[PDB]
Ligand binder design. Structure first.
Ligand SMILES: Cc1ccncc1NC(=O)[C@@H](c1cccc(Cl)c1)C(C)C
Ligand SMILES: Cc1ccncc1NC(=O)[C@@H](c1cccc(Cl)c1)C(C)C
Lengths: 304, 304
């Protein structure tokens, strides 16, 4: 009973958080095996951020300039390299708390948990989605850079995001663990605007299935629709177009509830055209799009 | 930038989760030092739950009937006792992962993180509030009993909740770690109805302060009000009455934003009387009441 915006347990990732200082700048690092991953803008001063030349700035840095601290103990840095927008600091000690892990580059619409950190210490955990415009709507302050996004399957942590920046509109941009930004963002203090933040249609449908499973059924109607008819409505409301791939992924939820995917699409269509009329769905007065079909199944079945 | 429903990092609590089996029933236990805490209904069969006599049922149980498993290793049970609605199983090994901890009984309106578990294994973490009717709106399935609610200050985990049951309306009831239920609930499979779920006014005001801090200011108006005038409106909308104690607790947020508490009360009054008019506040189309004034300060300052 009940449906909550649930994050993965953060323990396995807390044991990886370290603090990295280079000169006057301090941010977070992810320590996996004998490597510490961090945003390359740790080498920049506030003035450098306006138009940094990272290759040139990195020439003035040696292994001893990167101060890595895990808890209250200092790690010895024996190598350093730049991979896209991240620095990989080879230390002399493998992290004894390294969980089973993978580096994954997620697609927009996918969700993940963020362990927000400051000075290598965890402050909190929350659930995010990679928006269709490749930004994330997080909660990050100065010092939170190097905080990571991740998913967990059984005992394996799939790291997918590393926080780098905030756009002037209060949204967040970052990279995967190979240092490649999601979207067209650059690690420079320059005005970078986000594109249209469209709604993740398949996630909304998944959340409507979660609602039916938990007893909120008022929005179920007598109508059905087609993929093409639904998508005409989706385009109008800035919703992502729904494909047969999205329909396939909703299969298990459709099977459990007995409500055909296209019937749920017709309920969503009426919700878009008429609104909620002052009503709520799973304690929300808007259509929630940051639960994937996999998140709904996991939460509704008790996957540990 | 940004404001999220953030949970505390769960690692310190993950290291405490164990599985407890008694006969055919399996639920979660909290292992702190050499004691495992769990709901006393672990001794019940499905038939027992209708009208259990826990003292009588416990007579037929010995130390060897409580199977405690931490990960994949079995703990030896050397003592057992019932304290209110929890069982305290003395084991022969102190939990090496026991964090600094306290047992606190929270007041309604206070928030906490829940580490939902099944079979001693963590499934996810989310943020809850103790409702004014002493229920919590969680996400729990069969097997989640024994999952705990907690807050963290620096390195000390304050455990405040242990999950016991779901009411027929899909809301949740449980105890503090001394086994005392929050509210009037009993650990019996009997129809127990919740009272009015009133809105936590001080939390809504705290969240409006968080919104102003993050740039959502459209709801700020030219009005002010008094505690008595505001409370006439609060009574009408099933909001908790606001006291000078609530005003005092909002002091630091009032000081940071420069918006007097009674002015923010007048904005909230207009929001209650006029609605949102299709607009959003911090990505929400309703007035969020599960952030305390302390949660807003912590998130807005970066407390680790
Ligand atoms: C202040 C903040 C709040 C939340 N998240 C991150 C930051 N940090 C920055 O946005 C930094 C930044 C700007 C532009 C590009 C890059 Cl790579 C980094 C810096 C301007 C302080
Ligand atoms: C099924 C579920 C889902 C979510 N949270 C808890 C449960 N568990 C119960 O509600 C149990 C229960 C009922 C009445 C009293 C007590 Cl102490 C325990 C039992 C009826 C299965």
């Amino acid at each position: 009973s009940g449906f909550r915006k649930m994050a993965f347990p953060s323990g396995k990732v807390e044991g990886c958080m370290v603090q990295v200082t280079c000169g006057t700048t301090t941010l977070n690092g992810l320590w996996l095996d004998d490597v510490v991953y961090c945003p390359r803008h740790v080498i920049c001063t506030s003035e450098d951020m306006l138009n940094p030349n990272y290759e040139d700035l990195l020439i003035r840095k040696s292994n001893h300039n990167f101060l890595v601290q895990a808890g209250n103990v200092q790690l010895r840095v024996i190598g350093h390299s730049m991979q896209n927008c991240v620095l990989k600091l080879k230390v002399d000690t493998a992290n004894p708390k390294t969980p089973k892990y993978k580096f994954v580059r997620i697609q927009p619409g996918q969700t993940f948990s963020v362990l927000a950190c400051y000075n290598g210490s965890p402050s909190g955990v929350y659930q995010c989605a990679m928006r269709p415009n490749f930004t994330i709507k997080g909660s990050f302050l100065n010092g939170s850079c190097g905080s990571v996004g991740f998913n967990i399957d059984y005992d394996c942590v799939s790291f997918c995001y590393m926080h780098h920046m905030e756009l002037p509109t209060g949204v967040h941009a970052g990279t995967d663990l190979e240092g490649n930004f999601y979207g067209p963002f650059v690690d420079r203090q320059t005005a970078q605007a986000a594109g249209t933040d469209t709604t993740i249609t398949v996630n909304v449908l998944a959340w409507l299935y979660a609602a039916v499973i938990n007893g909120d059924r008022w929005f179920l109607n007598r109508f059905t629709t087609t993929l093409n008819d639904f998508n005409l409505v989706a385009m109008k409301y800035n919703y992502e177009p729904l494909t047969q791939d999205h329909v396939d992924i909703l299969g298990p939820l459709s099977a459990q509830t007995g409500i055909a995917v296209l019937d749920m699409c017709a309920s969503l269509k009426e919700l878009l055209q008429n609104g909620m009329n002052g009503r709520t769905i799973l304690g929300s007065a808007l259509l929630e799009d940051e639960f994937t079909p996999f998140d709904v199944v996991r939460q509704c079945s008790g996957v540990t």
